[PDB]
Design a protein around this ligand. Structure first.
Ligand SMILES: O=C(O)c1ccccc1/C=C/c1cccs1
Length: 121
């Protein structure tokens, strides 16, 4: 268990680029971490994204969020060629990054209070 509730992380899911997140407890499972059906560790995260999104993410697809400029180092893990991404996706990623930068300046307690999602039945 490398991450705790309120920790800022980058998550790599589906076809999306490394995305700013906050580790949180799953509302149903009441844990922020678990071992999956394949025996691998996963963390529950909330994305700093337009549609309120949460996901169980494989530990290998999660990295500590040290700052927005860390993005180049994440790409370097795969390693002049650059991959494009839609402008609309970049715009939503920039808003999420802006939220993550504000969250990074807070204490873990402040961040949990400010950003944890409200779940409705
Ligand atoms: O909701 C928005 O306007 C928004 C739009 C694009 C990217 C990120 C966000 C915000 C995410 C937040 C998570 C927890 C508290 S705010």
């Amino acid at each position: 268990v490398k991450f705790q509730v309120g920790d800022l992380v980058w998550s790599k899911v589906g076809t999306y680029p490394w995305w700013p997140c906050m580790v949180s407890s799953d509302p149903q499972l009441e844990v922020h971490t678990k071992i999956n059906t394949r025996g691998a560790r996963e963390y529950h995260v909330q994305f700093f994204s337009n549609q309120p999104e949460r996901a169980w993410v494989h530990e290998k697809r999660v990295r500590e969020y040290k700052g927005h400029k860390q993005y180049e180092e994440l790409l370097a893990e795969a390693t002049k060629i650059r991959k494009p991404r839609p402008q609309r996706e970049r715009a939503q990623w920039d808003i999420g990054i802006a939220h993550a930068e504000k969250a990074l300046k807070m204490t873990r307690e402040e961040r949990i209070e400010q950003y944890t999602f409200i779940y409705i039945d």
